[PDB]
Short mmCIF file of all heavy atoms in Angstrom, two decimals:
data_model
loop_
_atom_site.label_atom_id
_atom_site.label_comp_id
_atom_site.label_asym_id
_atom_site.label_seq_id
_atom_site.Cartn_x
_atom_site.Cartn_y
_atom_site.Cartn_z
N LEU G 122 67.41 39.63 -81.98
CA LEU G 122 67.87 40.38 -80.80
C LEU G 122 69.07 41.28 -81.22
O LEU G 122 69.87 40.93 -82.09
CB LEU G 122 68.33 39.43 -79.70
CG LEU G 122 68.11 39.88 -78.31
CD1 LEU G 122 66.69 40.35 -78.10
CD2 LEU G 122 68.48 38.81 -77.35
N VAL G 123 69.19 42.42 -80.59
CA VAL G 123 70.25 43.38 -81.00
C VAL G 123 71.26 43.52 -79.89
O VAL G 123 71.00 43.33 -78.72
CB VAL G 123 69.63 44.74 -81.37
CG1 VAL G 123 68.62 44.58 -82.52
CG2 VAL G 123 69.04 45.44 -80.19
N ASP G 124 72.50 43.85 -80.29
CA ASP G 124 73.62 44.22 -79.46
C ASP G 124 73.49 45.65 -78.88
O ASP G 124 73.08 46.55 -79.63
CB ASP G 124 74.97 44.01 -80.18
CG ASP G 124 74.88 44.55 -81.62
OD1 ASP G 124 74.02 45.37 -81.95
OD2 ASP G 124 75.80 44.16 -82.39
N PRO G 125 73.84 45.84 -77.60
CA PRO G 125 73.36 47.05 -76.91
C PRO G 125 74.00 48.36 -77.34
O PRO G 125 73.28 49.35 -77.55
CB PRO G 125 73.65 46.75 -75.45
CG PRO G 125 74.73 45.75 -75.43
CD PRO G 125 74.51 44.92 -76.68
N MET G 126 75.32 48.39 -77.54
CA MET G 126 76.03 49.68 -77.77
C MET G 126 76.58 49.62 -79.22
O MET G 126 77.48 50.44 -79.57
CB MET G 126 77.10 49.90 -76.72
CG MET G 126 77.57 51.36 -76.55
SD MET G 126 78.52 51.59 -75.00
CE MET G 126 77.20 51.51 -73.79
N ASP G 127 76.18 48.68 -80.00
CA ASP G 127 76.43 48.71 -81.47
C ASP G 127 75.10 48.84 -82.27
O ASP G 127 75.15 49.46 -83.35
CB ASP G 127 77.17 47.48 -81.92
CG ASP G 127 77.76 47.63 -83.38
OD1 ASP G 127 77.01 47.50 -84.34
OD2 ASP G 127 79.00 47.80 -83.49
N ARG G 128 74.02 48.31 -81.75
CA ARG G 128 72.67 48.38 -82.41
C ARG G 128 72.63 47.76 -83.79
O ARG G 128 72.50 48.43 -84.81
CB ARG G 128 72.14 49.81 -82.43
CG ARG G 128 72.16 50.46 -81.05
CD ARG G 128 71.08 49.85 -80.14
NE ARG G 128 70.69 50.63 -79.04
CZ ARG G 128 70.14 51.86 -79.02
NH1 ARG G 128 69.85 52.53 -80.14
NH2 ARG G 128 69.82 52.46 -77.86
N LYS G 129 72.81 46.41 -83.80
CA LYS G 129 72.76 45.62 -85.00
C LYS G 129 72.05 44.29 -84.70
O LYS G 129 72.13 43.80 -83.55
CB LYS G 129 74.14 45.38 -85.52
CG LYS G 129 74.33 44.85 -86.92
CD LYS G 129 75.62 45.30 -87.59
CE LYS G 129 75.58 46.77 -87.82
NZ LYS G 129 74.29 47.23 -88.50
N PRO G 130 71.34 43.71 -85.64
CA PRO G 130 70.79 42.33 -85.47
C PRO G 130 71.89 41.29 -85.25
O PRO G 130 72.82 41.16 -86.08
CB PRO G 130 69.99 42.08 -86.70
CG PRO G 130 70.43 43.16 -87.67
CD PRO G 130 70.74 44.33 -86.81
N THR G 131 71.76 40.53 -84.18
CA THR G 131 72.77 39.50 -83.86
C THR G 131 72.14 38.20 -83.44
O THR G 131 70.99 38.16 -82.90
CB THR G 131 73.73 40.03 -82.75
OG1 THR G 131 74.86 39.15 -82.62
CG2 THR G 131 73.02 40.23 -81.40
N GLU G 132 72.84 37.11 -83.68
CA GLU G 132 72.30 35.77 -83.35
C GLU G 132 72.83 35.29 -82.00
O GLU G 132 74.01 35.48 -81.66
CB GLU G 132 72.72 34.76 -84.42
CG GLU G 132 71.85 33.50 -84.45
CD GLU G 132 72.54 32.28 -85.01
OE1 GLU G 132 73.29 32.41 -85.96
OE2 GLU G 132 72.35 31.23 -84.44
N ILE G 133 71.94 34.69 -81.22
CA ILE G 133 72.15 34.50 -79.79
C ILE G 133 72.39 33.06 -79.48
O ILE G 133 71.63 32.18 -79.86
CB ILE G 133 70.94 35.06 -79.01
CG1 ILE G 133 70.97 36.58 -79.07
CG2 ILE G 133 70.97 34.62 -77.55
CD1 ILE G 133 72.23 37.21 -78.60
N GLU G 134 73.49 32.78 -78.78
CA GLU G 134 73.73 31.51 -78.12
C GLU G 134 73.52 31.66 -76.60
O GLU G 134 73.28 32.78 -76.11
CB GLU G 134 75.13 30.97 -78.34
CG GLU G 134 75.23 29.92 -79.40
CD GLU G 134 76.63 29.36 -79.48
OE1 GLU G 134 77.54 30.09 -79.97
OE2 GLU G 134 76.83 28.16 -79.13
N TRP G 135 73.61 30.54 -75.91
CA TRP G 135 73.52 30.60 -74.44
C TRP G 135 74.91 30.10 -73.99
O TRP G 135 75.31 28.98 -74.27
CB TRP G 135 72.41 29.72 -73.94
CG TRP G 135 71.04 30.25 -73.99
CD1 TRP G 135 70.19 30.18 -75.01
CD2 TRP G 135 70.37 31.01 -72.99
NE1 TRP G 135 69.02 30.82 -74.71
CE2 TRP G 135 69.08 31.32 -73.46
CE3 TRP G 135 70.74 31.45 -71.64
CZ2 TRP G 135 68.17 32.07 -72.72
CZ3 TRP G 135 69.82 32.16 -70.91
CH2 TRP G 135 68.53 32.44 -71.45
N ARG G 136 75.63 30.94 -73.30
CA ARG G 136 76.96 30.54 -72.82
C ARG G 136 76.99 30.54 -71.33
O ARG G 136 76.71 31.50 -70.64
CB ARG G 136 77.98 31.47 -73.42
CG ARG G 136 79.48 31.26 -72.95
CD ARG G 136 79.97 29.85 -72.89
NE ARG G 136 80.97 29.67 -71.91
CZ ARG G 136 81.18 28.55 -71.21
NH1 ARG G 136 80.37 27.50 -71.44
NH2 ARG G 136 82.11 28.45 -70.32
N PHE G 137 77.39 29.36 -70.72
CA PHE G 137 77.23 29.05 -69.33
C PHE G 137 78.42 29.70 -68.57
O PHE G 137 79.55 29.19 -68.69
CB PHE G 137 77.16 27.57 -69.07
CG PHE G 137 75.78 27.05 -68.98
CD1 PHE G 137 75.15 26.43 -70.00
CD2 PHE G 137 75.05 27.20 -67.80
CE1 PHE G 137 73.89 25.93 -69.91
CE2 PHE G 137 73.76 26.72 -67.70
CZ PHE G 137 73.19 26.11 -68.75
N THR G 138 78.18 30.72 -67.81
CA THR G 138 79.24 31.56 -67.31
C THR G 138 79.46 31.47 -65.80
O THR G 138 78.55 31.31 -65.02
CB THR G 138 78.98 33.05 -67.70
OG1 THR G 138 77.67 33.40 -67.30
CG2 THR G 138 79.13 33.23 -69.21
N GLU G 139 80.71 31.59 -65.45
CA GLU G 139 81.34 31.41 -64.09
C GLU G 139 80.63 32.19 -63.01
O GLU G 139 80.56 31.75 -61.91
CB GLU G 139 82.86 31.71 -64.16
CG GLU G 139 83.61 32.01 -62.85
CD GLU G 139 84.09 30.69 -62.20
OE1 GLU G 139 83.84 29.61 -62.74
OE2 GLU G 139 84.68 30.83 -61.09
N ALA G 140 80.14 33.40 -63.36
CA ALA G 140 79.40 34.22 -62.36
C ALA G 140 78.11 33.59 -61.94
O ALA G 140 77.55 33.91 -60.88
CB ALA G 140 79.17 35.60 -62.94
N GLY G 141 77.53 32.64 -62.75
CA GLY G 141 76.46 31.80 -62.23
C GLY G 141 75.05 32.08 -62.77
O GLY G 141 74.42 33.03 -62.35
N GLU G 142 74.54 31.22 -63.65
CA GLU G 142 75.34 30.27 -64.42
C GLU G 142 74.89 30.36 -65.85
O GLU G 142 75.71 30.18 -66.78
CB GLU G 142 75.21 28.87 -63.89
CG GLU G 142 76.24 27.86 -64.49
CD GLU G 142 77.66 28.05 -63.89
OE1 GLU G 142 77.88 28.79 -62.93
OE2 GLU G 142 78.62 27.42 -64.48
N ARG G 143 73.60 30.72 -66.09
CA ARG G 143 72.98 30.68 -67.41
C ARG G 143 72.63 32.08 -67.82
O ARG G 143 72.01 32.83 -67.05
CB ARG G 143 71.79 29.80 -67.38
CG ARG G 143 71.13 29.64 -68.71
CD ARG G 143 69.67 29.21 -68.62
NE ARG G 143 69.10 29.06 -70.01
CZ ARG G 143 69.13 27.95 -70.72
NH1 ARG G 143 69.69 26.85 -70.24
NH2 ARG G 143 68.58 27.94 -71.94
#
Side-chain angles (χ1 to χ4, degrees):
Chain G
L122 212 53
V123 305
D124 42 18
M126 202 165 288
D127 193 284
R128 304 290 200 61
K129 194 152 291 313
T131 191
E132 201 206 320
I133 288 304
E134 261 186 290
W135 281 88
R136 175 42 211 151
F137 264 101
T138 51
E139 161 86 0
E142 192 76 10
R143 184 201 180 90

